[PDB]
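User: Show me an example of a complex going from sequences to structure tokens.

Assistant: Sure. Here are the input components:
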Amino acid sequence: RYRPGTVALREIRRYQKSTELLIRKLPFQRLVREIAQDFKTDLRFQSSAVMALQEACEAYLVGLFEDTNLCAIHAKRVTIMPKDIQLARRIRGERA
Amino acid sequence: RYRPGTVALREIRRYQKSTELLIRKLPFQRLVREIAQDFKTDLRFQSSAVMALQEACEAYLVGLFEDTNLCAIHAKRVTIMPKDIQLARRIRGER
Amino acid sequence: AKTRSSRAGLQFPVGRVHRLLRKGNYSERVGAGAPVYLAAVLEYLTAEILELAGNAARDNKKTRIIPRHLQLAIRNDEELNKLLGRVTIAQGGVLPNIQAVLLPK
Amino acid sequence: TRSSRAGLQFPVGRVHRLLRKGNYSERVGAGAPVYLAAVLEYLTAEILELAGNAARDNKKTRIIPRHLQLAIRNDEELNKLLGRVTIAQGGVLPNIQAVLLPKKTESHHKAKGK
Amino acid sequence: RSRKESYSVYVYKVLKQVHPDTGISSKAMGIMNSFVNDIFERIAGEASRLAHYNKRSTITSREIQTAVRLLLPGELAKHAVSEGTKAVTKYTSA
Amino acid sequence: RSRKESYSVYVYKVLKQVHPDTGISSKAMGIMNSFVNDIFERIAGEASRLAHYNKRSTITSREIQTAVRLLLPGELAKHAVSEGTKAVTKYTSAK
Amino acid sequence: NIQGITKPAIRRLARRGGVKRISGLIYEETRGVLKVFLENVIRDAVTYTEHAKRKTVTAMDVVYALKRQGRTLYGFGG
Amino acid sequence: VLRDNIQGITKPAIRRLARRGGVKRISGLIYEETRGVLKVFLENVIRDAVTYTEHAKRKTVTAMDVVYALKRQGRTLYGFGG
DNA sequence: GGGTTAGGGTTAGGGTTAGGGTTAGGGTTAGGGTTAGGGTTAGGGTTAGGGTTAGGGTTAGGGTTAGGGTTAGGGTTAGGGTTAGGGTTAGG
DNA sequence: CTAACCCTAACCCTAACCCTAACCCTAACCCTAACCCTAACCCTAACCCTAACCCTAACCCTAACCCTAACCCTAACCCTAACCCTAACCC
């Protein structure tokens, strides 16, 4: 029995000290193949490409979450909002 | 006699509809030469380079002011603060 | 007949692009249809840019092409804004798109 | 060999052949590849020194991508030289912000009815 | 003196072809020349990269077509590809 | 069976020269190889751009030195320039 | 397949990124952003594979597309 | 020796720049922060131009070297030069 | 400055599950087998590339004088903070 | 099924753009004596055109000695309840 807003730092440190992968393998491969089937069908993937794309997406999501957390901290708010991710995507230059 | 926070839009539209230069020439040239004298002395400038640098600095300042105004609007504040320009310089990636 | 402009149906020079590609040391062998393709792409891009500039000049009640009209045509088109993102035009201008909060209310 | 004459260990003929095959210029010099090899050797020595320092600080005798990522993110010069560089299986820095903290106890346990 | 490129006569001819009632200035001509030079440099760099990646020595129209399809977004890319294929067929038939 | 570059033996020799009590892995070796390849590609591109801008056909050590001074910041740039000049003088004095 | 990214996955990603509090629509917004990025990357890889006269996307084409987009990746491939 | 050139950017200049950029309200330290940022950017650009001029075996910085430095930094400029 | 009074971290003691050490077979690399394929020179002239004079048509670089910012200053009201629990709404 | 966020409804002042008139610096020119950029060979030494047989560099040989995750065990690194300057602000 603990109080809220205290045990989150332990999980944050545990996830930051580890360099393992969080996203799965079969659902990500299925989503990648479903997206690739929209352009040209009969496409294959040598696994390594899917892992590289997953690592790139993980790095991009980590950077976006860091920018959103910094913007929320500057805006005097521990929580995040869709307007925060909109401001992040607008200031970073990627679209809009 | 007018009220505050109303005549600023007229000046904004007047400055946006015009494509003239706001920064001077002799002080900018003096500052550029003083900065260039720190690295290597006996340097000259063919005016056109100083004008190109001034135009680039004007575009950069306009973009920075636009980003700061957008961040301040998102932060529910019409005015700007040094923390806003710090957040802008941190998110944009430039140092 | 004697020039490639009368055979390919274009106006941009092909031999100039071929000589520039041969002098730029980009590859060992530069083809002959590749410069024609590049000239056609450049011609289409120039035609689209000139059409946008003429439309902006006609909307601004002007018969000439000024950098302001080019900047307006670039910032108005979404495709031209994505193709030329970090492009600064001297003596161009900005868009007077006032925000919804920046109003006298 | 050029390694016994220039006092280096990186190959010079390999860089010269790569520059001649890459079609970067019409004539590639002979001292320019030596300069590039010396610069690459100094950069590799600095990177290996940072990796060894990180491994010694982390109580490890090997070079892992985590140590390389830590040495890259710790040095300000290496962060500016390699800005938008993503290293697979590297990691991030656990630099918690000043606001993201448990702070203090307001009213014992945030209870005004006691 | 010397001799410069200055892509101006062809741009003026294209402008007179699409709109003979309008003109152009020196600043606009310089901007168009810089844009054309930047596009040509980007196309040459993309073609060189594709040739170095495909382990080839020659350059064909397929490399420049792919470079245009990668640089240009969608509608402009498809229009440029169609116009280039039409010009190639016209140059090959005649 | 083909043949790949794989800059590994030289990196291992440099590591044993600076610290013979430590080793390296395959992932770290691949990361170092990719970094070296990227640095070499950037240097080659900068040298080609400088040669095309200076209207020259040959490439000397001054072009690569300027490319290093432009890519590297300050202290690392000056250290690399000094080490390159020392290596050039050592290679010139000893044929 | 778009709903494959579960809620605990985004929660762990936000905890690793330093986020201490998540709203509701953040998951859907991150899903859309990831879908758009994956679509663009897959389109670039398909164009590269079609230029290389191949069908199966390899790691070299992925590295080339990542370098063209502006985000290099080390370790994976060569 | 040249001095007092950092304070050349007057207050009305930054006010007009902010009005053109869409800023409807300016604080106090914004002027000093913009002055420092412009000084840093000018220092970097001048250093790059000096390096380019020293590589070109020249002294006076021309417009071509300025365009080259702007393209190397990552911000192209059209119109000025060629 | 000082009228006291909201507000900043903080470390004695209590807390038990979170770091400390730890440990055993094969998992993970490094000094050993060989030969052929690039790394590295050793004989021949040459063509892109350095040294040096002058002259030449500039062009960065000495200065006038008069008016639009320039700041000269203030208000006062307007857009900035400063918070009560209310359901409440996301957190383990 | 728990307590700290959390967002707008009570209330604050110190920061904060509009402002006309003493203002006295800079911008179209002006030669002018000091000077860096470009054209004809001179000639000269370093690198391309390519042998020689070399001394050195890639897969594997079976072990080699200090690399895995995890097999018993000690004990203290963050959890929470009193506590002492320190700058904050209104007398």
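The lines above are the inputs; the final block is the predicted structure for all ten components together. The domain at 1-101 of chain D is CATH 1.10.20.10 (Histone, subunit A).
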